[model samples]
Structure formats: C-alpha cells, structure tokens
Target: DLGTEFQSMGLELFLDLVSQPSRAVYIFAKKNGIPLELRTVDLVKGQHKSKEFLQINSLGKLPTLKDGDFILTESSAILIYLSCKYQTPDHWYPSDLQARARVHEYLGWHADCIRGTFGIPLWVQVLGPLIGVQVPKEKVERNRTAMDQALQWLEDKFLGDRPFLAGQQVTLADLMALEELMQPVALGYELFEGRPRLAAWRGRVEAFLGAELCQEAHSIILSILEQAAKKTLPTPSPEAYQAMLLRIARIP
Candidate 1:
C-alpha cells in the first residue's frame, strides 16, 4: 500500500537540502503543492556514493528526479519538468514567449556567476575544514570580489527594478537564484547587506514562497555552520573527501 500510494501521488526527488539546487527544487515542489517523495541523499556522509544512490543516478548528482520509469538529472530540468507536468502557474515558468526567455536568460548567467561564486563560502568555511583542508585566504578574498562583481551585474543587467529576477512576477529563475545567493548567507556572509535592491528582491521571493516553506527548505543550510562548529557533523568518507578536495582546489 505504501508503494502503491507513493506512485499514485507522483514523482520522487532525491535531495540534500544543504545543496542549494536541491533546496530550490524542494521549495518549488512544496510551494506548488507538487506531490513528491523526498529521498534524502546526505552529501556529508557520502550517501551519494552508496550502491543505493548510484543505482538511481550514476552521476550521483543531488536533486535527481525519478518519475516512475523516467529519470532526470539537473535541478533546472527538474524544476521545468515539475512546472509543466503540474501546470502550477503561468508565473512560474511564464507563458509569454519573451517572459519565458527572460527566465532562461537569468538561469544561464546564474549558473555561470551566481552558482559558482556563492557556494565558495560554504566550501571555504565549513566543508573544507570538515575534511582537514583549508581553502586559502587569498582565494577566499577573491571569491568576495567575484561575489561583489556578480551582484553588480545582477542589479544592473537582470534585476534592475523588476520585482523579481525575471520580471514583475516570481519564476523558477528567482527560486534558483535565491537559493544560490542564500548559501553564502548561511555560511556567515552578509550578502544582502547594504544592497537594498537585492535584499528587497529576496524578501519578495520568500514572501511569495511563504515564510513557513522557506524556513523548512532553508533550515538545514542555515544551521550547517553552527553544527560544524559544534562538531556534530559526521566526517565525510574518503571518497567524499577526495571529491571535496578536488572541488576546493578548483576554486578560482
């Protein structure tokens, strides 16, 4: 009955909330009332390397979607899939051609600038140290400058005076963008400080998503550093350590 009932509901999302894209997928599903089975894949403990996870996704990426016989990877793909299948709202993916293109535009730039830049703080502060490595101070400062430059482009080019990243209405773009930006804040960067435009945009995105759901999606990430400090976090397996070290080294 559990299996039957789960299938009757809808797809499954393999997620680790500490991962920003996973948080985005989670928020989108919960916000739209998309029926989903959440399969938690803990990156810290290297659950992604287990046979169980590898069977589901050989790539072992977070935010994998399994809809019965069908499988999908990438958070953006999952977001769009859920939006179209459920037909949640026009505002989410946008019905108008130009408006939809705006969503895609932001997403591409976001992947390049926001995603890479924002996540460095988490690696530098928590994940690196957790694995007996320290991201160099020089690279850490470089990340700060990169963040500031990205924010300026975000403000001038994409956001401007729009109520959301894409336009007057919230879209998948805002959701993805917010989660990436929030990663640094969770790791103790005052990302929105002295940036009224971006801060207000964050308020709008969270308000539209509602406080409760945002809190639920964000709780794990927000408390990660605190847990790291308390030494409550489990050590990454050797496999996870190697991957983590590679990621840290790739930081530019």
Candidate 2:
C-alpha cells in the first residue's frame, strides 16, 4: 500500500536516503503523506554524478526538487518550498510570523553548526579512508570536541526546556536537527548516550514519526556497519570522491 503511493506524479523529489539532508526531505514529505514522484538518486553508486543529474543540479546535489519546469536545489530551500506549495501543516513551516522566523533562523544555525560538521565522521572514517585519505588523529579528536560543544549548545541554547527545538510542538527545526544528528550516529558515534535530554528528544521524534519508517529511511547507512566488516563498501566513482573531498576538505 505504501509502496504504491511512494512514486506518485506531479511533484518530484530527487533524493538519496544515505544523505542527511535528503533523509530530512523524505521524512518531512513522507510523514505528511505527500504524493511525490520519488526519484531515487544513488549517491554511493555515482548516479548523482551522472551528467543528467548534474544538468538538473550543477553541483550534483541530491534532494533536488522539480515541479513542472520549476527546479530547486539546497535542502532548506526545497523543504520550505515544498511545505508552502503543498500546504503542509503549519507546524512544518508555521503560519505565524514569529514561529516561521524561528524555523528559518534554526535552518541557518543548523547549516553552519550541525550540517557540515556532523557528516565529517563518514568522510574521515569510511569515505575518505576508502580513497586512502585519513584525517589526522589530532584533527579527529578536535572534531569530536567540537561536536560535543555543538551538542551542548543544541541543548542549553536551542532545545533548553522546550519539548522540541523551536517550541512546544514538533517543527521543521526538530526534523532538521534530528537528521543531522543521525549522521554522526550512523558513523558509530552514539551521541545521545550521555545526554538524557537529547536522547529523550530523539525518542520523541522517532515515536512521532514511527520507528519502522525511521529504520526504513536509515537502512542504507545502517547496513554499512555490517557491510564494512564484510568488505563490501561501495566504491563511488572518482568524480564522486573528488566531490566528497571538497565536502570534507576543511576537517581541521
């Protein structure tokens, strides 16, 4: 039943679930029961690097959106546009000026603080080393410290006593932050182990969205934990490796 509705027409979302932002896009759209033409772009297999996908998104970014001739890139922009056009529940983008602005503000903070830094583990641990580039131990330790500090801010400054990131109700801020946090988790860092508040928040999010669907969305990344031992890691194309290098070039 769910499978039949997943790849509907009208709007299309080009996505790879292994991507953090891409998963956020899918979770938002999927949770809302949006009938999307799911365009599965395999990042691990170099499909995102294909000339056709490159034509759609010059940067070869997954989670690209197309509505008729209108095209969009960047997950934040795509999320906002989708929420508005589809008339999703107000909590997603919010109808109020203050609440909507809160969502936008969190998006900016998330990109600067969480999005770029959280996925570094995947590069430094698996993706980069596969290409024979290992980030130095000092830098890796520094990144860990940085990630820890970010978590503190996420709790004290952003989450605080609120039930969710932006406010009392679940919103885009919660969805976006949870997805970014998941990146590090997938890479073998159980960030929530010591932080009860953070873990509780994550539990709430998973329960709200349904644990089964969360596993479904995260299956690719989770599979790598076992596949790595079996020596079956995907070999992304050279161009993808170059793109990945650019992504993690500033690890220090």
Candidate 3:
C-alpha cells in the first residue's frame, strides 16, 4: 500500500491578494479554470518572512509558484508558464508567432512605464504613513504628471485602434494594465475619467472578462480604503511595514 502511494498538486501558486501583479495571476487562473491550488502568502501579515515561506523562496517574493517541485517567482513569468502548461484559450497567450511577440512587447513597455508611475498614490496616501514615511505633496503631483504622460503613450501606441492592447483579443497585456491602473483609482484618482478611449477600452475588457471574475479579483483592493477607514484592516508587522517602505522607496 505504501509503495503504491503518490501525492501531488499539479500546480500551486503562492500569491498576495493585495499585490497588483498577484491579482493578474489570480484572475488568469480563475478565469481559465486552471487547476491551481492557491497558497496565499499573506504579505500584509509578514508571513512572507516566516521560516516556512523562506524555504519556498529565499527572496520571499509574493506570487512564487511551485509546479511539480519546480519553483518560479515573478508575476509575469508565472502567468506565461500557467498559460502554456494549462493550455488556456489561445487568445489569452496566443500561439501565432507574431501575436505572442506582441504580447511580450506590450509587457516590456508596461514594465518601463506603468509599474512605477501608476502605483505612487498608494505609497503617498496609504502605504507611506502606514509605515511612517509621508511622501512630499510635490512628489505626489510629480507622479501624477508622469502617470498622465504614460496614459497618452498607452493610448496612442498600444490601444489606439485595437480592441485590446496587442490585437483583436484580450491577452495578458490587458490584464496587467487594468490592475496597475486600478491602484491609483482605488485610492480615488479614477485615471479613466476624462479619458474616453481608455475608459471605453476598460469597459470592453471588463465586460468580456466577465463581471464575476473582475469582482472576485478586485474586491480586496477595491475595498481596502474602507477597511482602512474603519480600522478593521489588518496591520502589517513591523518587519512587514519596513519591507513595504523599502519597496516604495525605490520609486523616483
């Protein structure tokens, strides 16, 4: 009996719900019905630094994944791997050579422009003082300016006439953009306001992606401010808060 026993979880994803990148992975897997066991490394609680988690990832990054004893970290890499291994709809990752290249192209630009610029509000408004660092008001306005510039490039270069970022179908590119933009919006900046095309593009993606998956993926982040206001939010450990400050400090 013992010799015949074998146990396995085909795919396992370690994620933090509040992280924008992690939300992308969460939405992709949930939408496609990828059979992944969701292992949440509670970044807010400092569990990422715990002894058990460190064994899985020495760097203690969120969205670390383990698939059949193999390990992967980083949100974008994790999403690509899942798409291939699970054979998700071709539109999600695409198999045609040019189409796949377009997906990567969009992701590269996003890493450069969107990642740092869009998330500043959370640090300036919430995570900064949440860890005891109050960002300067001038710095906050500067970030807003940078966000505006990036939005213009996003419209003209990527989403100009296409229904989606890379092509006629929604790919990981759309998912990544939407989640990062939401960071500022959740804090009250609604980047979509006054930007008719971007707003309409967002509406199309949300409607196509389905309301249920959007609601599930976004609920934690969408309501985070309310939780903060009611004092019902879970406070980060000193170690966690310090780690958070280190992350925000990287921004210009």
**TM values, all candidates:** 0.95, 0.93, 0.92
- The candidate, 2 or 3, that scores higher on lDDT is 3
**C-alpha lDDT score of every prediction, in listed order:** 0.88, 0.83, 0.85
* Residue 205 shift from truth in candidate 1, angstroms: 0.9
Between which residue pairs do clashes occur in model 3? none
Off by over 4 Å in 1: 1-10
lDDT of 3 by residue, 1-252 (tens): 242112245677888778899899998888888878888778777888877777778898888888776889988899998888888889988999999999999999999999878878877877777666888777888899999999998899999987888999999999999999988888899799888989989999999889998988888888877776676756788778878878777766
Residue pairs with colliding backbones in model 2 are: none
Considering every candidate listed, which one attains the maximal lDDT? 1
Preferred candidate (TM-score higher): 1 or 2:
1
Q: Where is the poorest 10-residue window by lDDT in model 3?
A: 1-10
> What lDDT would candidate 3 get against the real structure?
0.85
| Shift of residue 245 alpha carbon in model 1, Å | 1.2
Q: Provide the clash count, candidate 3.
A: 0
